[PDB]
Design an enzyme around this catalytic site. Structure first.
Site, PDB file in Angstrom:
ATOM      1  N   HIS A  41     -11.622   2.202  -1.268  1.00  0.00           N
ATOM      2  CA  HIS A  41     -12.530   1.120  -1.073  1.00  0.00           C
ATOM      3  C   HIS A  41     -11.939   0.168   0.257  1.00  0.00           C
ATOM      4  O   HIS A  41     -12.566  -0.854   0.494  1.00  0.00           O
ATOM      5  CB  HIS A  41     -12.830   0.332  -2.352  1.00  0.00           C
ATOM      6  CG  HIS A  41     -11.737  -0.546  -2.626  1.00  0.00           C
ATOM      7  ND1 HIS A  41     -10.727  -0.302  -3.652  1.00  0.00           N
ATOM      8  CD2 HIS A  41     -11.163  -1.604  -2.160  1.00  0.00           C
ATOM      9  CE1 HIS A  41      -9.956  -1.302  -4.168  1.00  0.00           C
ATOM     10  NE2 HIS A  41     -10.243  -2.000  -3.112  1.00  0.00           N
ATOM     11  N   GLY A 143      -5.996  -8.385  -3.256  1.00  0.00           N
ATOM     12  CA  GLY A 143      -5.104  -7.822  -2.138  1.00  0.00           C
ATOM     13  C   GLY A 143      -4.075  -7.047  -2.842  1.00  0.00           C
ATOM     14  O   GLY A 143      -3.183  -6.414  -2.053  1.00  0.00           O
ATOM     15  N   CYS A 145      -4.754  -4.334  -4.797  1.00  0.00           N
ATOM     16  CA  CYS A 145      -5.193  -2.936  -4.713  1.00  0.00           C
ATOM     17  C   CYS A 145      -4.014  -1.917  -3.953  1.00  0.00           C
ATOM     18  O   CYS A 145      -3.765  -2.459  -2.893  1.00  0.00           O
ATOM     19  CB  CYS A 145      -6.828  -2.807  -4.150  1.00  0.00           C
ATOM     20  SG  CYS A 145      -7.805  -3.926  -5.177  1.00  0.00           S
TER      21      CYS A 145
HETATM   22  C1  LIG Z   1      -9.867  -9.543  -7.280  1.00  0.00           C
HETATM   23  C2  LIG Z   1      -8.690  -8.434  -8.001  1.00  0.00           C
HETATM   24  C3  LIG Z   1      -7.953  -8.818  -8.896  1.00  0.00           C
HETATM   25  C4  LIG Z   1      -7.024  -7.959  -9.315  1.00  0.00           C
HETATM   26  N1  LIG Z   1      -7.182  -6.657  -9.202  1.00  0.00           N
HETATM   27  C5  LIG Z   1      -8.038  -6.337  -8.269  1.00  0.00           C
HETATM   28  C6  LIG Z   1      -9.046  -6.999  -7.618  1.00  0.00           C
HETATM   29  N2  LIG Z   1      -9.921  -6.614  -6.363  1.00  0.00           N
HETATM   30  C7  LIG Z   1     -11.003  -6.118  -6.835  1.00  0.00           C
HETATM   31  O1  LIG Z   1     -11.163  -5.667  -8.155  1.00  0.00           O
HETATM   32  C8  LIG Z   1     -12.072  -5.557  -6.001  1.00  0.00           C
HETATM   33  C9  LIG Z   1     -13.203  -4.612  -6.303  1.00  0.00           C
HETATM   34  C10 LIG Z   1     -14.151  -4.819  -6.621  1.00  0.00           C
HETATM   35  C11 LIG Z   1     -15.032  -3.740  -7.088  1.00  0.00           C
HETATM   36  C12 LIG Z   1     -14.568  -2.476  -7.137  1.00  0.00           C
HETATM   37  C13 LIG Z   1     -13.182  -2.124  -6.511  1.00  0.00           C
HETATM   38 BR1  LIG Z   1     -12.764  -0.497  -6.733  1.00  0.00          BR
HETATM   39  C14 LIG Z   1     -12.282  -3.269  -6.222  1.00  0.00           C
END
Ligand SMILES: Cc1ccncc1NC(=O)Cc1cccc(Br)c1
Ligand SMILES: Cc1ccncc1NC(=O)Cc1cccc(Br)c1
Lengths: 304, 304
Positions: A41, A143, A145
């Protein structure tokens, strides 16, 4: 003595973290040999995440669009490919800090350390379990990820997790290092059901053994139980059914303490049915399931 | 989202660990620049520990008696000196992996990461607090002496603790990096009283703020309190009295959540007087005091 939620030393993994930027998205990558692994992503904008066609989004990208920075220095990207939900960016330089490593798919109920990173920089390390429903209850922000989970067996790092997503419930989802999600998740901004979770029974029993080793023994009782009887209680309290394979892995702890596994099961049964009565076990007021029997042995023997 | 007991990444500290052997005793040393720091009891036999005369025991030792091994390689010891309860062994080679570092004496109630080591090899990392009574509740076995506690501010490691001893109660005692014990302890095999401990009130309030930030808010109530009223409850429940200095450091968390510090104090007051009623806060069934307000901000903002 003492028993803590101990993570593996993160140094070998810190040396592999890089920042990967594609367009306006920046996340973490893992640089091992001449390949950088990161969540696919990184190629999406926020608009794309509602239903991304990753194959099409990746076709619009060239090697020069993937900006990889190993702290101070820029890596030259000479190839890119998507494997399941991860991108593999071939770089022209092998990471000099690459430790001996393996990619492993861990089982639900197993534990690992997470090196949480932002912009390719490590922020902290914590130990956690892969829940029976294939989620992890981590500590991750936007951030994070591309941060990875791992275990270490002397000089070998077994990478088992790469963080991808936070579910609307605040729990976390990710993949093995071949890009396969643990659980039913997909990398899309859609509400997704995580299965019914359960408590990891074998880990709670291992932790009760760790408690006896470290002096907390108020919960030991004069009772015993059977696997069948214990499993009726496990059912009622949403604990994983205990099998002979779990009893077998608890063998070393049973031998070290002289407390037969079914006798420890009877203590766990009474704790489930009565609660803690305002008492604690190893500084916890609840039954802890994030230590495997191997973790308890390793911590209680001093393995490096 | 999510909130974990996160330790600092240990890599910078792993690169400083060495094994120090003097006669039949082996423990861990910390190699920074051209000096190796270790607990002075490395010069004792078991017989000596009942009442060691360290000055006399050290007089029988020469530079060549201190065997320092940095994993694979042996360091050449060209000087030795005792400073309080630590030995400083001057070596002929500066550690190439020496990070930017400081030696700091931390205050009771502050937190730090511990890199537990055995024979100069890191085994695990965990976060803990220096108790108000100057003990730490760590996870240490025989051979862990010389393992260090530290904090990291970007690229600077502030070393604050070196492990020396396990009290007969199973709690841990050690020194700052100048060899001064935290608390009233002495490096001798004698039963030693650790003071009455208290719960770190400002840390519990910071953790309640972390809970609200991460969605756990059942404990918020319609009440407020005063410092005086709150401190009567803190007294009854063996919590540290809250001061304006603690309220001031909670300012950023109060601003981020819009919950005035005295209103969070009223939630803490009700939790002390009523308990959790079988509920949890951030996966804990007790009031957690091992996160400082700085830790909560750092974890909740993603500082690297
Ligand atoms: C904001 C955040 C917080 C903690 N861990 C991860 C995140 N980020 C996400 O989830 C962004 C995202 C959205 C939809 C699908 C996918 Br694959 C990734
Ligand atoms: C056995 C152990 C476990 C955990 N941490 C530390 C230890 N080791 C000790 O306490 C040995 C010792 C004895 C008396 C004084 C001093 Br200084 C050191």
């Amino acid at each position: 003595s003492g028993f803590r939620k101990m993570a593996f030393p993160s140094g070998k993994v810190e040396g592999c973290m890089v920042q990967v930027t594609c367009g306006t998205t920046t996340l973490n990558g893992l640089w091992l040999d001449d390949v950088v692994y990161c969540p696919r992503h990184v190629i999406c904008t926020s608009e794309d995440m509602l239903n991304p066609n990753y194959e099409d989004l990746l076709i619009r990208k060239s090697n020069h669009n993937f900006l990889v920075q190993a702290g101070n220095v820029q890596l030259r990207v000479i190839g890119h490919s998507m494997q399941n939900c991860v991108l593999k960016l071939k770089v022209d330089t092998a990471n000099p800090k690459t430790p001996k490593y393996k990619f492993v798919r861990i089982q639900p109920g197993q534990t690992f350390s997470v090196l949480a990173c932002y912009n390719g920089s490590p922020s902290g390390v914590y130990q956690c379990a892969m829940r029976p429903n294939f989620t992890i209850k981590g500590s991750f922000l936007n951030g994070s990820c591309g941060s990875v989970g791992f275990n270490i067996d002397y000089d070998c790092v077994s990478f088992c997790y790469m963080h991808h997503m936070e579910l609307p419930t605040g729990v976390h989802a990710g993949t093995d290092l071949e890009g396969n999600f643990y659980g039913p998740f997909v990398d899309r901004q859609t509400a997704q059901a995580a299965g019914t979770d359960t408590t990891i029974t074998v880990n709670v029993l291992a932790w009760l053994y760790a408690a006896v080793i470290n002096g907390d023994r108020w919960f030991l009782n004069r009772f015993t139980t059977t696997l069948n009887d214990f499993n009726l209680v496990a059912m009622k309290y949403n604990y994983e059914p205990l099998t002979q394979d779990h009893v077998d892995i608890l063998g070393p702890l049973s031998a070290q303490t002289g407390i037969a596994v079914l006798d420890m099961c009877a203590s766990l049964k009474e704790l489930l049915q009565n609660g803690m009565n305002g008492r604690t076990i190893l500084g916890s007021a609840l039954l802890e399931d994030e230590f495997t029997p191997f973790d308890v042995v390793r911590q209680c023997s001093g393995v490096t």
